[PDB]
Amino acid sequence: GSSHHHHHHMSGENLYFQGASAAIVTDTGGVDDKSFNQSAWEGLQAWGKEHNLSKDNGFTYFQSTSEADYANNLQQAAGSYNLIFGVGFALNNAVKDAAKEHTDLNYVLIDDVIKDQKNVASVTFADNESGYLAGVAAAKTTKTKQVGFVGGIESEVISRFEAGFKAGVASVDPSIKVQVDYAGSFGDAAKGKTIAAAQYAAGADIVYQVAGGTGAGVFAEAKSLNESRPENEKVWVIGVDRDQEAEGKYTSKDGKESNFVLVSTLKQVGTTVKDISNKAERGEFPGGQVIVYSLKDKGVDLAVTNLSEEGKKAVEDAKAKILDGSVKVPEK
Ligand SMILES: Nc1ccn([C@@H]2O[C@H](CO)[C@@H](O)[C@H]2O)c(=O)n1
Ligand code: NI
Ligand code: NI
């Protein structure tokens, strides 16, 4: 206001900020998947450090054993936590039922939308846009003109990555074959390994793994192949969610230390967890809203890493065309 004549002083010794307690509930696996779950957890840990908290004293994670465990994990979380993140589209129905039971608590669904629930915020990422950039990169480096995509679970979410990836590859060279295989799980490394083994055997020189912890198998297969060959015949992996450059270190057959990560799509799940936790604690929880992260706000990106200069220029050009609306990336 212009003036505030009726005012009273509050001494700093009497003032306090009321904190919140935040928990993530996993859709499958732990907080060491080197991707989705880990990004969320490092976010929550960073938030905890900023607020002088520690694990099980202000923040924690509940690992889900199956779909049947979602409801039980959310109900357990409601004992001590007043901000609860369902990390993954699979938690949709369970988060919806939990928010209706506990109208005094705040819930966040990561990667999916719940409508008409005042205590639920939804967060989506334009993974089609980051996928497109990964496709431009893949198309500018493949020598076999054959690339692979290993999906976790067939879904709207993984279809965004897949549609974006195909469109990006075709934007550079439509001749390039994309082999698509799904593991049917985000926590099945053994299946990631067999799919990657077959994709590489069928002549892919690059595999984009978009399957969470299932992707550990794709890294395992590419490492084994690359260790038993010369450096100049290595096959590539594209990283997902986190910059996975450090996961691609190996020694070739001819004793050269190298790296088989070409590029990584980024999905700033951690940053969203920290930002929404800060908003919940300040009493500004965005209940009932859908928060869309895209290339524009750097909620998704491509880490260029080991890409050729001509690759980086095609990526910069594709990014500019996505931001200005010149290129519309398909979501399916
Ligand atoms: N446990 C997991 C792991 C991953 N995902 C989805 O798969 C994408 C690639 O890791 C992630 O970005 C995410 O969309 C998931 O839904 N649940
Ligand atoms: Ni004023
Ligand atoms: Ni007064």
PDB file of all heavy atoms in Angstrom, residues 26-30 33 35-37 87-90 110-111 125 127 150-153 155 157-158 160-161 185-187 208-214 240-241 265 267 269, ligand 1:
ATOM      1  N   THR A  26       8.575 -43.294  -4.705  1.00  0.00           N
ATOM      2  CA  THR A  26       9.113 -43.859  -5.954  1.00  0.00           C
ATOM      3  C   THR A  26       8.009 -44.695  -6.638  1.00  0.00           C
ATOM      4  O   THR A  26       7.148 -45.213  -5.928  1.00  0.00           O
ATOM      5  CB  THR A  26      10.345 -44.607  -5.452  1.00  0.00           C
ATOM      6  OG1 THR A  26      11.481 -43.816  -5.785  1.00  0.00           O
ATOM      7  CG2 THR A  26      10.363 -46.039  -5.900  1.00  0.00           C
ATOM      8  N   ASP A  27       8.028 -44.839  -7.961  1.00  0.00           N
ATOM      9  CA  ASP A  27       7.100 -45.735  -8.704  1.00  0.00           C
ATOM     10  C   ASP A  27       7.697 -47.150  -8.790  1.00  0.00           C
ATOM     11  O   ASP A  27       6.935 -48.102  -9.028  1.00  0.00           O
ATOM     12  CB  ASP A  27       6.720 -45.177 -10.085  1.00  0.00           C
ATOM     13  CG  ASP A  27       7.789 -45.133 -11.165  1.00  0.00           C
ATOM     14  OD1 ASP A  27       8.941 -45.509 -10.890  1.00  0.00           O
ATOM     15  OD2 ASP A  27       7.467 -44.656 -12.276  1.00  0.00           O
ATOM     16  N   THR A  28       9.009 -47.256  -8.635  1.00  0.00           N
ATOM     17  CA  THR A  28       9.793 -48.515  -8.666  1.00  0.00           C
ATOM     18  C   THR A  28      11.260 -48.197  -8.433  1.00  0.00           C
ATOM     19  O   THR A  28      11.727 -47.169  -8.930  1.00  0.00           O
ATOM     20  CB  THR A  28       9.738 -49.287  -9.991  1.00  0.00           C
ATOM     21  OG1 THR A  28      10.405 -50.512  -9.694  1.00  0.00           O
ATOM     22  CG2 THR A  28      10.446 -48.629 -11.155  1.00  0.00           C
ATOM     23  N   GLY A  29      11.937 -49.077  -7.713  1.00  0.00           N
ATOM     24  CA  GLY A  29      13.388 -49.004  -7.497  1.00  0.00           C
ATOM     25  C   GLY A  29      13.768 -47.931  -6.496  1.00  0.00           C
ATOM     26  O   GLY A  29      12.880 -47.303  -5.851  1.00  0.00           O
ATOM     27  N   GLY A  30      15.070 -47.756  -6.319  1.00  0.00           N
ATOM     28  CA  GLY A  30      15.586 -46.828  -5.318  1.00  0.00           C
ATOM     29  C   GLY A  30      15.953 -45.509  -5.946  1.00  0.00           C
ATOM     30  O   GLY A  30      15.589 -45.214  -7.091  1.00  0.00           O
ATOM     31  N   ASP A  33      19.208 -44.946  -9.372  1.00  0.00           N
ATOM     32  CA  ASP A  33      18.931 -45.354 -10.777  1.00  0.00           C
ATOM     33  C   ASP A  33      19.769 -44.531 -11.768  1.00  0.00           C
ATOM     34  O   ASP A  33      19.562 -44.715 -12.981  1.00  0.00           O
ATOM     35  CB  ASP A  33      17.428 -45.254 -11.073  1.00  0.00           C
ATOM     36  CG  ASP A  33      16.841 -43.835 -11.120  1.00  0.00           C
ATOM     37  OD1 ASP A  33      17.578 -42.867 -10.808  1.00  0.00           O
ATOM     38  OD2 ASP A  33      15.640 -43.711 -11.499  1.00  0.00           O
ATOM     39  N   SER A  35      19.315 -41.772 -12.820  1.00  0.00           N
ATOM     40  CA  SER A  35      18.448 -40.987 -13.729  1.00  0.00           C
ATOM     41  C   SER A  35      17.303 -40.283 -12.992  1.00  0.00           C
ATOM     42  O   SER A  35      17.554 -39.421 -12.212  1.00  0.00           O
ATOM     43  CB  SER A  35      17.940 -41.827 -14.858  1.00  0.00           C
ATOM     44  OG  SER A  35      17.679 -43.138 -14.434  1.00  0.00           O
ATOM     45  N   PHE A  36      16.083 -40.700 -13.287  1.00  0.00           N
ATOM     46  CA  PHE A  36      14.823 -40.089 -12.811  1.00  0.00           C
ATOM     47  C   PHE A  36      14.736 -39.978 -11.286  1.00  0.00           C
ATOM     48  O   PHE A  36      14.625 -38.882 -10.793  1.00  0.00           O
ATOM     49  CB  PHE A  36      13.658 -40.867 -13.409  1.00  0.00           C
ATOM     50  CG  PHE A  36      12.298 -40.264 -13.234  1.00  0.00           C
ATOM     51  CD1 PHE A  36      11.993 -39.029 -13.766  1.00  0.00           C
ATOM     52  CD2 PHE A  36      11.308 -40.958 -12.573  1.00  0.00           C
ATOM     53  CE1 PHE A  36      10.721 -38.505 -13.645  1.00  0.00           C
ATOM     54  CE2 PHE A  36      10.040 -40.424 -12.437  1.00  0.00           C
ATOM     55  CZ  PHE A  36       9.751 -39.194 -12.971  1.00  0.00           C
ATOM     56  N   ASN A  37      14.725 -41.116 -10.608  1.00  0.00           N
ATOM     57  CA  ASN A  37      14.611 -41.192  -9.139  1.00  0.00           C
ATOM     58  C   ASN A  37      15.775 -40.463  -8.470  1.00  0.00           C
ATOM     59  O   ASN A  37      15.520 -39.773  -7.521  1.00  0.00           O
ATOM     60  CB  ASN A  37      14.545 -42.632  -8.653  1.00  0.00           C
ATOM     61  CG  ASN A  37      13.260 -43.341  -9.008  1.00  0.00           C
ATOM     62  OD1 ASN A  37      13.131 -44.522  -8.774  1.00  0.00           O
ATOM     63  ND2 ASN A  37      12.304 -42.638  -9.563  1.00  0.00           N
ATOM     64  N   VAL A  87       6.602 -39.620  -7.709  1.00  0.00           N
ATOM     65  CA  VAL A  87       7.594 -39.449  -8.783  1.00  0.00           C
ATOM     66  C   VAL A  87       7.343 -40.539  -9.824  1.00  0.00           C
ATOM     67  O   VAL A  87       7.849 -41.667  -9.662  1.00  0.00           O
ATOM     68  CB  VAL A  87       9.013 -39.459  -8.189  1.00  0.00           C
ATOM     69  CG1 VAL A  87      10.078 -39.267  -9.245  1.00  0.00           C
ATOM     70  CG2 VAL A  87       9.129 -38.399  -7.119  1.00  0.00           C
ATOM     71  N   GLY A  88       6.589 -40.194 -10.865  1.00  0.00           N
ATOM     72  CA  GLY A  88       6.345 -41.072 -12.018  1.00  0.00           C
ATOM     73  C   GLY A  88       4.883 -41.131 -12.321  1.00  0.00           C
ATOM     74  O   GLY A  88       4.099 -41.063 -11.368  1.00  0.00           O
ATOM     75  N   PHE A  89       4.536 -41.230 -13.598  1.00  0.00           N
ATOM     76  CA  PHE A  89       3.128 -41.207 -14.053  1.00  0.00           C
ATOM     77  C   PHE A  89       2.348 -42.356 -13.390  1.00  0.00           C
ATOM     78  O   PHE A  89       1.139 -42.182 -13.148  1.00  0.00           O
ATOM     79  CB  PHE A  89       3.076 -41.252 -15.578  1.00  0.00           C
ATOM     80  CG  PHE A  89       3.548 -42.537 -16.213  1.00  0.00           C
ATOM     81  CD1 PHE A  89       2.699 -43.632 -16.329  1.00  0.00           C
ATOM     82  CD2 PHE A  89       4.828 -42.638 -16.723  1.00  0.00           C
ATOM     83  CE1 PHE A  89       3.147 -44.809 -16.910  1.00  0.00           C
ATOM     84  CE2 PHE A  89       5.258 -43.799 -17.332  1.00  0.00           C
ATOM     85  CZ  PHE A  89       4.418 -44.886 -17.417  1.00  0.00           C
ATOM     86  N   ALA A  90       2.998 -43.495 -13.108  1.00  0.00           N
ATOM     87  CA  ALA A  90       2.314 -44.700 -12.573  1.00  0.00           C
ATOM     88  C   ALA A  90       1.621 -44.377 -11.240  1.00  0.00           C
ATOM     89  O   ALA A  90       0.619 -45.041 -10.932  1.00  0.00           O
ATOM     90  CB  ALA A  90       3.275 -45.880 -12.461  1.00  0.00           C
ATOM     91  N   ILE A 110       4.631 -35.990 -10.466  1.00  0.00           N
ATOM     92  CA  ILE A 110       5.679 -35.727 -11.477  1.00  0.00           C
ATOM     93  C   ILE A 110       5.393 -36.619 -12.680  1.00  0.00           C
ATOM     94  O   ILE A 110       5.156 -37.812 -12.463  1.00  0.00           O
ATOM     95  CB  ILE A 110       7.086 -35.952 -10.906  1.00  0.00           C
ATOM     96  CG1 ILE A 110       7.356 -35.072  -9.688  1.00  0.00           C
ATOM     97  CG2 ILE A 110       8.135 -35.763 -11.985  1.00  0.00           C
ATOM     98  CD1 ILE A 110       7.505 -33.622  -9.987  1.00  0.00           C
ATOM     99  N   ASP A 111       5.386 -36.002 -13.864  1.00  0.00           N
ATOM    100  CA  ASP A 111       5.187 -36.578 -15.225  1.00  0.00           C
ATOM    101  C   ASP A 111       3.724 -36.869 -15.566  1.00  0.00           C
ATOM    102  O   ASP A 111       3.534 -37.562 -16.527  1.00  0.00           O
ATOM    103  CB  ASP A 111       6.038 -37.809 -15.535  1.00  0.00           C
ATOM    104  CG  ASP A 111       7.424 -37.562 -16.083  1.00  0.00           C
ATOM    105  OD1 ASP A 111       7.678 -36.493 -16.593  1.00  0.00           O
ATOM    106  OD2 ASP A 111       8.219 -38.448 -15.982  1.00  0.00           O
ATOM    107  N   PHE A 125       7.082 -32.421 -18.312  1.00  0.00           N
ATOM    108  CA  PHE A 125       8.289 -31.991 -19.044  1.00  0.00           C
ATOM    109  C   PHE A 125       8.073 -32.244 -20.535  1.00  0.00           C
ATOM    110  O   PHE A 125       7.549 -33.316 -20.895  1.00  0.00           O
ATOM    111  CB  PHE A 125       9.486 -32.744 -18.489  1.00  0.00           C
ATOM    112  CG  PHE A 125       9.800 -32.431 -17.048  1.00  0.00           C
ATOM    113  CD1 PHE A 125       9.190 -33.131 -16.017  1.00  0.00           C
ATOM    114  CD2 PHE A 125      10.751 -31.470 -16.730  1.00  0.00           C
ATOM    115  CE1 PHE A 125       9.516 -32.852 -14.696  1.00  0.00           C
ATOM    116  CE2 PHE A 125      11.109 -31.229 -15.417  1.00  0.00           C
ATOM    117  CZ  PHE A 125      10.490 -31.908 -14.401  1.00  0.00           C
ATOM    118  N   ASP A 127       9.714 -33.574 -22.875  1.00  0.00           N
ATOM    119  CA  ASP A 127      10.781 -34.551 -23.204  1.00  0.00           C
ATOM    120  C   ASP A 127      10.834 -34.789 -24.718  1.00  0.00           C
ATOM    121  O   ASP A 127      11.855 -35.323 -25.180  1.00  0.00           O
ATOM    122  CB  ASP A 127      10.568 -35.871 -22.455  1.00  0.00           C
ATOM    123  CG  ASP A 127      10.554 -35.725 -20.934  1.00  0.00           C
ATOM    124  OD1 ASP A 127      11.551 -35.120 -20.383  1.00  0.00           O
ATOM    125  OD2 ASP A 127       9.550 -36.221 -20.295  1.00  0.00           O
ATOM    126  N   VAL A 150      15.535 -47.555 -26.556  1.00  0.00           N
ATOM    127  CA  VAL A 150      15.116 -48.554 -25.546  1.00  0.00           C
ATOM    128  C   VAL A 150      14.207 -47.848 -24.543  1.00  0.00           C
ATOM    129  O   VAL A 150      14.733 -47.071 -23.734  1.00  0.00           O
ATOM    130  CB  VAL A 150      16.299 -49.218 -24.839  1.00  0.00           C
ATOM    131  CG1 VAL A 150      15.814 -50.227 -23.807  1.00  0.00           C
ATOM    132  CG2 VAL A 150      17.269 -49.881 -25.806  1.00  0.00           C
ATOM    133  N   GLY A 151      12.897 -48.069 -24.649  1.00  0.00           N
ATOM    134  CA  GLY A 151      11.895 -47.439 -23.780  1.00  0.00           C
ATOM    135  C   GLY A 151      11.698 -48.280 -22.552  1.00  0.00           C
ATOM    136  O   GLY A 151      11.977 -49.502 -22.601  1.00  0.00           O
ATOM    137  N   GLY A 152      11.256 -47.681 -21.460  1.00  0.00           N
ATOM    138  CA  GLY A 152      10.882 -48.468 -20.280  1.00  0.00           C
ATOM    139  C   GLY A 152       9.500 -49.060 -20.488  1.00  0.00           C
ATOM    140  O   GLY A 152       9.376 -50.197 -20.927  1.00  0.00           O
ATOM    141  N   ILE A 153       8.478 -48.277 -20.201  1.00  0.00           N
ATOM    142  CA  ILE A 153       7.056 -48.701 -20.268  1.00  0.00           C
ATOM    143  C   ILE A 153       6.349 -47.868 -21.320  1.00  0.00           C
ATOM    144  O   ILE A 153       6.448 -46.631 -21.266  1.00  0.00           O
ATOM    145  CB  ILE A 153       6.389 -48.569 -18.898  1.00  0.00           C
ATOM    146  CG1 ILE A 153       7.106 -49.456 -17.876  1.00  0.00           C
ATOM    147  CG2 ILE A 153       4.909 -48.899 -18.995  1.00  0.00           C
ATOM    148  CD1 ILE A 153       6.344 -49.645 -16.585  1.00  0.00           C
ATOM    149  N   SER A 155       3.800 -45.715 -22.957  1.00  0.00           N
ATOM    150  CA  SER A 155       3.081 -44.652 -22.221  1.00  0.00           C
ATOM    151  C   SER A 155       3.155 -43.341 -22.989  1.00  0.00           C
ATOM    152  O   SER A 155       4.045 -43.205 -23.848  1.00  0.00           O
ATOM    153  CB  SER A 155       3.694 -44.461 -20.835  1.00  0.00           C
ATOM    154  OG  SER A 155       5.089 -44.212 -20.941  1.00  0.00           O
ATOM    155  N   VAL A 157       4.191 -40.632 -21.769  1.00  0.00           N
ATOM    156  CA  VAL A 157       5.465 -39.993 -21.322  1.00  0.00           C
ATOM    157  C   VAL A 157       6.610 -40.483 -22.207  1.00  0.00           C
ATOM    158  O   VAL A 157       7.327 -39.639 -22.786  1.00  0.00           O
ATOM    159  CB  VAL A 157       5.721 -40.244 -19.827  1.00  0.00           C
ATOM    160  CG1 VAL A 157       7.105 -39.782 -19.431  1.00  0.00           C
ATOM    161  CG2 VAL A 157       4.674 -39.545 -18.969  1.00  0.00           C
ATOM    162  N   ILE A 158       6.779 -41.784 -22.354  1.00  0.00           N
ATOM    163  CA  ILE A 158       7.922 -42.331 -23.139  1.00  0.00           C
ATOM    164  C   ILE A 158       7.677 -42.103 -24.634  1.00  0.00           C
ATOM    165  O   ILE A 158       8.662 -41.941 -25.363  1.00  0.00           O
ATOM    166  CB  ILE A 158       8.196 -43.802 -22.774  1.00  0.00           C
ATOM    167  CG1 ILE A 158       8.332 -43.969 -21.258  1.00  0.00           C
ATOM    168  CG2 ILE A 158       9.419 -44.328 -23.478  1.00  0.00           C
ATOM    169  CD1 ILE A 158       9.431 -43.119 -20.642  1.00  0.00           C
ATOM    170  N   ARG A 160       6.396 -39.341 -25.866  1.00  0.00           N
ATOM    171  CA  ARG A 160       6.949 -37.986 -26.103  1.00  0.00           C
ATOM    172  C   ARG A 160       8.431 -38.101 -26.460  1.00  0.00           C
ATOM    173  O   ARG A 160       8.833 -37.545 -27.480  1.00  0.00           O
ATOM    174  CB  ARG A 160       6.798 -37.077 -24.887  1.00  0.00           C
ATOM    175  CG  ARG A 160       5.491 -36.307 -24.862  1.00  0.00           C
ATOM    176  CD  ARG A 160       5.501 -35.248 -23.798  1.00  0.00           C
ATOM    177  NE  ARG A 160       4.164 -35.224 -23.263  1.00  0.00           N
ATOM    178  CZ  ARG A 160       3.789 -35.715 -22.094  1.00  0.00           C
ATOM    179  NH1 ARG A 160       4.667 -36.248 -21.261  1.00  0.00           N
ATOM    180  NH2 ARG A 160       2.522 -35.625 -21.744  1.00  0.00           N
ATOM    181  N   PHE A 161       9.229 -38.788 -25.646  1.00  0.00           N
ATOM    182  CA  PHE A 161      10.672 -38.944 -25.905  1.00  0.00           C
ATOM    183  C   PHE A 161      10.857 -39.565 -27.287  1.00  0.00           C
ATOM    184  O   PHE A 161      11.738 -39.125 -28.044  1.00  0.00           O
ATOM    185  CB  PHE A 161      11.348 -39.842 -24.876  1.00  0.00           C
ATOM    186  CG  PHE A 161      11.632 -39.289 -23.513  1.00  0.00           C
ATOM    187  CD1 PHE A 161      10.714 -39.411 -22.489  1.00  0.00           C
ATOM    188  CD2 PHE A 161      12.871 -38.751 -23.224  1.00  0.00           C
ATOM    189  CE1 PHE A 161      11.005 -38.953 -21.215  1.00  0.00           C
ATOM    190  CE2 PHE A 161      13.176 -38.310 -21.946  1.00  0.00           C
ATOM    191  CZ  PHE A 161      12.245 -38.421 -20.940  1.00  0.00           C
ATOM    192  N   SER A 185       9.422 -52.249 -18.336  1.00  0.00           N
ATOM    193  CA  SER A 185       9.777 -51.908 -16.930  1.00  0.00           C
ATOM    194  C   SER A 185      10.876 -50.821 -16.876  1.00  0.00           C
ATOM    195  O   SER A 185      11.749 -50.798 -17.785  1.00  0.00           O
ATOM    196  CB  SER A 185      10.215 -53.153 -16.193  1.00  0.00           C
ATOM    197  OG  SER A 185      10.671 -52.844 -14.883  1.00  0.00           O
ATOM    198  N   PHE A 186      10.856 -50.026 -15.803  1.00  0.00           N
ATOM    199  CA  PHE A 186      11.874 -49.024 -15.406  1.00  0.00           C
ATOM    200  C   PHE A 186      12.859 -49.639 -14.408  1.00  0.00           C
ATOM    201  O   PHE A 186      13.828 -48.946 -14.033  1.00  0.00           O
ATOM    202  CB  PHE A 186      11.196 -47.774 -14.820  1.00  0.00           C
ATOM    203  CG  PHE A 186      10.358 -46.996 -15.802  1.00  0.00           C
ATOM    204  CD1 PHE A 186       9.012 -46.798 -15.604  1.00  0.00           C
ATOM    205  CD2 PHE A 186      10.947 -46.422 -16.912  1.00  0.00           C
ATOM    206  CE1 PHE A 186       8.263 -46.101 -16.533  1.00  0.00           C
ATOM    207  CE2 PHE A 186      10.206 -45.697 -17.825  1.00  0.00           C
ATOM    208  CZ  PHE A 186       8.865 -45.541 -17.640  1.00  0.00           C
ATOM    209  N   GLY A 187      12.659 -50.885 -13.958  1.00  0.00           N
ATOM    210  CA  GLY A 187      13.612 -51.527 -13.018  1.00  0.00           C
ATOM    211  C   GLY A 187      13.987 -52.940 -13.441  1.00  0.00           C
ATOM    212  O   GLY A 187      13.862 -53.865 -12.595  1.00  0.00           O
ATOM    213  N   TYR A 208      19.809 -44.661 -27.476  1.00  0.00           N
ATOM    214  CA  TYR A 208      19.160 -43.769 -26.484  1.00  0.00           C
ATOM    215  C   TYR A 208      18.315 -44.635 -25.545  1.00  0.00           C
ATOM    216  O   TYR A 208      17.358 -45.279 -26.028  1.00  0.00           O
ATOM    217  CB  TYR A 208      18.361 -42.716 -27.251  1.00  0.00           C
ATOM    218  CG  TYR A 208      17.687 -41.628 -26.458  1.00  0.00           C
ATOM    219  CD1 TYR A 208      18.147 -41.235 -25.202  1.00  0.00           C
ATOM    220  CD2 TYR A 208      16.604 -40.953 -26.992  1.00  0.00           C
ATOM    221  CE1 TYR A 208      17.518 -40.229 -24.480  1.00  0.00           C
ATOM    222  CE2 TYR A 208      15.968 -39.949 -26.287  1.00  0.00           C
ATOM    223  CZ  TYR A 208      16.450 -39.562 -25.044  1.00  0.00           C
ATOM    224  OH  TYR A 208      15.778 -38.593 -24.364  1.00  0.00           O
ATOM    225  N   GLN A 209      18.721 -44.689 -24.282  1.00  0.00           N
ATOM    226  CA  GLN A 209      18.007 -45.480 -23.254  1.00  0.00           C
ATOM    227  C   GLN A 209      17.104 -44.540 -22.465  1.00  0.00           C
ATOM    228  O   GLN A 209      17.601 -43.664 -21.822  1.00  0.00           O
ATOM    229  CB  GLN A 209      18.942 -46.306 -22.375  1.00  0.00           C
ATOM    230  CG  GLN A 209      20.238 -45.622 -22.010  1.00  0.00           C
ATOM    231  CD  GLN A 209      20.137 -44.790 -20.760  1.00  0.00           C
ATOM    232  OE1 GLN A 209      19.689 -45.242 -19.729  1.00  0.00           O
ATOM    233  NE2 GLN A 209      20.556 -43.549 -20.849  1.00  0.00           N
ATOM    234  N   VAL A 210      15.806 -44.755 -22.562  1.00  0.00           N
ATOM    235  CA  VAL A 210      14.794 -43.937 -21.852  1.00  0.00           C
ATOM    236  C   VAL A 210      13.953 -44.931 -21.060  1.00  0.00           C
ATOM    237  O   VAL A 210      12.817 -45.127 -21.398  1.00  0.00           O
ATOM    238  CB  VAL A 210      13.963 -43.129 -22.858  1.00  0.00           C
ATOM    239  CG1 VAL A 210      13.028 -42.164 -22.169  1.00  0.00           C
ATOM    240  CG2 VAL A 210      14.851 -42.407 -23.855  1.00  0.00           C
ATOM    241  N   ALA A 211      14.547 -45.489 -20.012  1.00  0.00           N
ATOM    242  CA  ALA A 211      13.930 -46.580 -19.237  1.00  0.00           C
ATOM    243  C   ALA A 211      14.396 -46.584 -17.782  1.00  0.00           C
ATOM    244  O   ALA A 211      14.368 -47.625 -17.177  1.00  0.00           O
ATOM    245  CB  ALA A 211      14.267 -47.876 -19.921  1.00  0.00           C
ATOM    246  N   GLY A 212      14.807 -45.439 -17.261  1.00  0.00           N
ATOM    247  CA  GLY A 212      15.229 -45.327 -15.857  1.00  0.00           C
ATOM    248  C   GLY A 212      16.332 -46.315 -15.568  1.00  0.00           C
ATOM    249  O   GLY A 212      17.328 -46.298 -16.306  1.00  0.00           O
ATOM    250  N   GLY A 213      16.164 -47.107 -14.507  1.00  0.00           N
ATOM    251  CA  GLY A 213      17.176 -48.058 -14.009  1.00  0.00           C
ATOM    252  C   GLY A 213      17.388 -49.231 -14.958  1.00  0.00           C
ATOM    253  O   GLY A 213      18.479 -49.835 -14.915  1.00  0.00           O
ATOM    254  N   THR A 214      16.390 -49.556 -15.793  1.00  0.00           N
ATOM    255  CA  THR A 214      16.532 -50.538 -16.899  1.00  0.00           C
ATOM    256  C   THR A 214      17.740 -50.150 -17.753  1.00  0.00           C
ATOM    257  O   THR A 214      18.409 -51.062 -18.246  1.00  0.00           O
ATOM    258  CB  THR A 214      15.262 -50.631 -17.748  1.00  0.00           C
ATOM    259  OG1 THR A 214      14.241 -51.188 -16.930  1.00  0.00           O
ATOM    260  CG2 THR A 214      15.422 -51.442 -19.014  1.00  0.00           C
ATOM    261  N   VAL A 240      20.144 -40.046 -20.145  1.00  0.00           N
ATOM    262  CA  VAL A 240      18.756 -39.564 -19.938  1.00  0.00           C
ATOM    263  C   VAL A 240      18.603 -39.046 -18.513  1.00  0.00           C
ATOM    264  O   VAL A 240      19.234 -39.598 -17.622  1.00  0.00           O
ATOM    265  CB  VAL A 240      17.739 -40.684 -20.242  1.00  0.00           C
ATOM    266  CG1 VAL A 240      17.719 -41.761 -19.181  1.00  0.00           C
ATOM    267  CG2 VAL A 240      16.351 -40.149 -20.492  1.00  0.00           C
ATOM    268  N   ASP A 241      17.785 -38.010 -18.350  1.00  0.00           N
ATOM    269  CA  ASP A 241      17.383 -37.364 -17.068  1.00  0.00           C
ATOM    270  C   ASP A 241      18.528 -36.538 -16.458  1.00  0.00           C
ATOM    271  O   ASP A 241      18.359 -35.346 -16.330  1.00  0.00           O
ATOM    272  CB  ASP A 241      16.697 -38.343 -16.109  1.00  0.00           C
ATOM    273  CG  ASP A 241      15.543 -39.144 -16.704  1.00  0.00           C
ATOM    274  OD1 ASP A 241      14.862 -38.643 -17.577  1.00  0.00           O
ATOM    275  OD2 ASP A 241      15.346 -40.247 -16.267  1.00  0.00           O
ATOM    276  N   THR A 265      20.049 -36.218 -22.501  1.00  0.00           N
ATOM    277  CA  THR A 265      18.848 -35.372 -22.309  1.00  0.00           C
ATOM    278  C   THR A 265      18.789 -35.075 -20.804  1.00  0.00           C
ATOM    279  O   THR A 265      19.197 -35.960 -19.996  1.00  0.00           O
ATOM    280  CB  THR A 265      17.590 -36.002 -22.924  1.00  0.00           C
ATOM    281  OG1 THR A 265      17.333 -37.279 -22.337  1.00  0.00           O
ATOM    282  CG2 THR A 265      17.712 -36.166 -24.421  1.00  0.00           C
ATOM    283  N   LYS A 267      16.482 -33.611 -17.529  1.00  0.00           N
ATOM    284  CA  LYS A 267      15.112 -33.443 -17.008  1.00  0.00           C
ATOM    285  C   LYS A 267      15.275 -32.986 -15.568  1.00  0.00           C
ATOM    286  O   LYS A 267      15.713 -33.797 -14.787  1.00  0.00           O
ATOM    287  CB  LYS A 267      14.357 -34.763 -17.141  1.00  0.00           C
ATOM    288  CG  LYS A 267      12.867 -34.680 -16.886  1.00  0.00           C
ATOM    289  CD  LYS A 267      12.211 -36.039 -16.917  1.00  0.00           C
ATOM    290  CE  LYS A 267      10.732 -35.968 -17.211  1.00  0.00           C
ATOM    291  NZ  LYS A 267      10.233 -37.215 -17.824  1.00  0.00           N
ATOM    292  N   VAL A 269      14.311 -32.744 -12.608  1.00  0.00           N
ATOM    293  CA  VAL A 269      13.329 -33.227 -11.605  1.00  0.00           C
ATOM    294  C   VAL A 269      13.744 -32.704 -10.226  1.00  0.00           C
ATOM    295  O   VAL A 269      12.881 -32.198  -9.523  1.00  0.00           O
ATOM    296  CB  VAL A 269      13.191 -34.758 -11.609  1.00  0.00           C
ATOM    297  CG1 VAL A 269      12.065 -35.190 -10.663  1.00  0.00           C
ATOM    298  CG2 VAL A 269      12.953 -35.291 -13.008  1.00  0.00           C
TER     299      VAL A 269
HETATM  300  N1  LIG B   1      11.318 -45.101 -12.267  1.00  0.00           N
HETATM  301  C1  LIG B   1      11.022 -44.407 -13.355  1.00  0.00           C
HETATM  302  C2  LIG B   1      12.066 -44.089 -14.159  1.00  0.00           C
HETATM  303  C3  LIG B   1      11.832 -43.389 -15.303  1.00  0.00           C
HETATM  304  N2  LIG B   1      10.603 -43.015 -15.590  1.00  0.00           N
HETATM  305  C4  LIG B   1      10.395 -42.271 -16.819  1.00  0.00           C
HETATM  306  O1  LIG B   1      11.375 -42.706 -17.761  1.00  0.00           O
HETATM  307  C5  LIG B   1      12.125 -41.556 -18.163  1.00  0.00           C
HETATM  308  C6  LIG B   1      13.542 -41.939 -18.558  1.00  0.00           C
HETATM  309  O2  LIG B   1      14.295 -42.419 -17.446  1.00  0.00           O
HETATM  310  C7  LIG B   1      12.035 -40.590 -17.002  1.00  0.00           C
HETATM  311  O3  LIG B   1      12.239 -39.256 -17.396  1.00  0.00           O
HETATM  312  C8  LIG B   1      10.601 -40.818 -16.581  1.00  0.00           C
HETATM  313  O4  LIG B   1       9.680 -40.159 -17.454  1.00  0.00           O
HETATM  314  C9  LIG B   1       9.548 -43.315 -14.744  1.00  0.00           C
HETATM  315  O5  LIG B   1       8.413 -42.937 -15.033  1.00  0.00           O
HETATM  316  N3  LIG B   1       9.761 -44.041 -13.633  1.00  0.00           N
END
